[PDB]
Design a protein around this ligand. Structure first.
Ligand SMILES: Cc1cc2nc3c(=O)[nH]c(=O)nc-3n(C[C@H](O)[C@H](O)[C@H](O)COP(=O)(O)OP(=O)(O)OC[C@H]3O[C@@H](n4cnc5c(N)ncnc54)[C@H](O)[C@@H]3O)c2cc1C
Ligand SMILES: Cc1cc2nc3c(=O)[nH]c(=O)nc-3n(C[C@H](O)[C@H](O)[C@H](O)COP(=O)(O)OP(=O)(O)OC[C@H]3O[C@@H](n4cnc5c(N)ncnc54)[C@H](O)[C@@H]3O)c2cc1C
Lengths: 273, 271
């Protein structure tokens, strides 16, 4: 209507299905009146390696250089490398962030991992006070759009590779939700190399159709921070009263908070209402 | 005489990560190992897959596909020499140690890229040879990780959730997939609030562990023989195995939880 979307893409080839999914998303969103900004990491020749050069001003302690402390000072005093700042401005402006990439070694591409490492600086994107649902990006929504070479069966409960819910957890909880994002159901496109042409087209069409109402979707469930004692003396442990309330239940809260029990089915793949 | 490769992913020589690497090299050399290093930052290693990785002629430059093109390049021998040099270190090594700080619940970008550029099809995996049948089944690997946050935060009840789940994609997805026997990870929690004298004890503990590292029992992964390894069956668990497991209360592993309880410390302690 009058909302902003960022699309981060991590694929080198304009001939790729990844690129086509990005184009389809931009088209669909623009048609419904969104403003669309892109970060095409390979086209930008984005530098994915954290280093001293990310700080253009004066180091606090060059003799014992610590990237987390030094990057936070640089953020506050405003001497971060301009390539980092430009990306941060896109994020600040955006209501919806889409990440489009191929699954590579059960994770994000190195160039995208580096983007997180260089852009998601302390204070900007997280603090130890404002974690998870209290994080800075709690007004924003994010969604992963992933393609894989292997088939869906391989990432089922009984598949050789094991449950896809577990693979996504470090990314969706550890990076996105940790900073505050409401995380939407991931778009998973399995065995894209061995999918026939007419099927690929349906997939694109289905993606575009989904994006028309993306904003009204229910997000994935993570344990609220209010279930925990958020201080160093308690060790950031789940509150005793919450532990007692959960003693009898058969399922845990999430993939990461399985509590030694069964994982709620598709905790990281499907929302519940 | 056995060979060990140490991969390090930290930019600073003043870091505890660097110290752990030095300690490992010293301990291993003293017991008569040969030690090779890949200090990724010191090497200015390039972590981004691209066309430039193939020095010869592309099969199809109009529709470039890194997996197909890198495999041809491996077989015909026109991979970029920086890749080949690393591959030779791996082929030679019996034991591979990965030393890095946990960054966004994973490996640093530079190390992720090393996997992406070096673990090429045919060299490191095939399709026939996956998991326990993989090319590196003669070799052993171990992760040595530091974190800023405390152990309690990565317990079952901690804010961040179970560490076993965080390690799974790396230990199963990357290492075991290529054949490695994966040893108990060395986990150094809350390194930022640990004083100098304590850090030295930790180093001493690490060195002590390494004297007998080879004789350790590895972590448990589901054997590939539990699965139908072909495209028509969809790489699913065999029906006979499914039926045998129906009544058990625990699953096999973190990834193979089967909707049941995860065996405690599946990714942190051996049986
Ligand atoms: C380092 C590395 C690690 C990997 N690790 C994993 C892993 O852990 N798990 C896994 O499952 N896979 C893995 N893979 C495989 C990888 O995830 C796939 O190659 C990737 O998802 C394929 O997507 P693509 O966009 O590259 O496809 P492409 O191969 O470029 O595209 C697929 C097909 O779509 C066609 N196409 C392109 N545009 C369009 C369009 N507009 N309309 C219709 N058709 C179109 C193409 O011509 C082609 O036929 C890995 C690959 C690499 C390089
Ligand atoms: C981008 C990014 C993302 C991160 N994400 C996460 C995350 O998701 N989760 C998480 O838990 N953490 C995270 N961290 C934190 C990070 O993992 C820790 O800061 C790291 O584990 C610190 O270890 P180090 O080797 O860098 O030590 P340093 O702090 O660099 O060094 C420790 C001290 O030991 C001293 N020293 C050197 N040699 C010796 C010796 N022989 N004996 C005694 N002292 C010695 C040094 O001089 C120094 O003062 C992240 C950090 C970054 C930069």
């Amino acid at each position: 209507v009058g909302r902003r979307a960022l699309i981060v893409l991590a694929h080198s080839e304009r001939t790729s299905f990844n690129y086509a999914m990005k184009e389809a998303a931009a088209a669909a969103l623009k048609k419904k009146g969104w403003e669309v900004v892109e970060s095409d990491l390979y086209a930008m020749n984005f530098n994915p390696i954290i280093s001293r050069k990310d700080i253009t001003g004066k180091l606090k302690d060059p003799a014992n250089f610590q990237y987390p402390a030094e990057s936070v000072l640089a953020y506050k005093e405003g001497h971060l490398s301009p390539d980092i700042v430009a990306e941060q401005k896109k994020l600040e402006a955006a209501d919806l962030v889409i990440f489009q990439f191929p699954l590579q070694w059960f994770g994000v591409p190195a160039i995208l991992k580096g983007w997180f490492e260089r852009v998601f600086i302390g204070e900007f994107a997280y603090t130890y006070a404002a974690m998870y649902d209290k994080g800075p990006f709690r007004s924003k929504k994010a969604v992963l759009s992933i393609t894989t070479g292997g088939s869906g069966s391989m990432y089922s409960l009984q598949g050789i590779h094991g449950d896809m819910n577990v693979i996504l957890w470090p990314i969706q909880s550890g990076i996105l939700h940790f900073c505050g994002f409401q995380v939407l159901e991931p778009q998973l496109t399995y065995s894209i190399g061995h999918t026939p042409a007419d099927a690929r087209i349906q997939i694109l069409e289905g993606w575009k159709k989904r994006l028309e109402n993306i904003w009204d979707e229910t997000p994935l469930y993570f344990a609220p921070s209010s279930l925990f004692d958020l201080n160093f003396q308690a060790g950031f442990l789940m509150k005793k009263e919450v532990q007692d309330e959960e003693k009898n239940k058969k399922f845990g809260l999430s993939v990461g908070h399985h509590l030694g029990k069964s994982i709620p089915t598709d905790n990281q793949i499907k929302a519940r209402k």
